[PDB]
Design a binder for this molecule. Sequence first.
Ligand SMILES: *[C@@H]1O[C@H](CO)[C@@H](O)[C@H](O)[C@H]1NC(C)=O
Ligand SMILES: [Cu+2]
Length: 228
Amino acid sequence: HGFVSGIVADGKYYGGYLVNQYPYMSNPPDTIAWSTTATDLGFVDGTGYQSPDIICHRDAKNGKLTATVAAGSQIEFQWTTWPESHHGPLITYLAPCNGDCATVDKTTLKFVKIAAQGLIDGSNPPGVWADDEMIANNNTATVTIPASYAPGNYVLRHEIIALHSAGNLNGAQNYPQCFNIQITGGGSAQGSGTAGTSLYKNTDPGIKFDIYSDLSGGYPIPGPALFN
Ligand SMILES: *[C@@H]1O[C@H](CO)[C@@H](O)[C@H](O)[C@H]1NC(C)=O
Ligand SMILES: [Cu+2]
């Protein structure tokens, strides 16, 4: 259970969608982060993989602001304190808004996987994962925006998949957080995206996954192919 409280882009801090505060007000602050109704700091599980909730978490609604970021530079995502039990991958995507992200219909977004980290050391189940490294780094995850990416308006979708209960069907817990960004500089490249409601199936091997048994077979990070 947790959420992204803010991000750093081009070295500038942007406050996120404070889901434990902003829903409890008529007129919360503007943010680059999408609003959600996930006030229990909870998740979308496999029962919702085909729901609009998987896109940006949820009942999510477009953030009002947009952060500029140079292609080829780093974004830091500051999570709230992440529980050790919730081992799993960190996956980050870009979807073009093809227009203004403040008004794009989220149901139309097609996400390209730009970063993904999974099982780091599975010598001893339940293993050490991407989220374990995030915990150790002041509950912060980092990605690089590809240097060759086309300049434009994008939804940045950053997600933890907790796998502590993932041996159960629909037991994997997805924690997507979305932000509006404007990539500057860059090149001409873009991936071919996947609708949010097409990212995952509850039968995918990295979704219906047992962290507690021998990990000699590794961990197949779910979702579409990683962009190069
Ligand atoms: C740790 O993260 C918090 C937000 O969770 C941030 O406010 C603080 O500045 C960070 N500490 C360091 C040393 O960067
Ligand atoms: Cu939890």
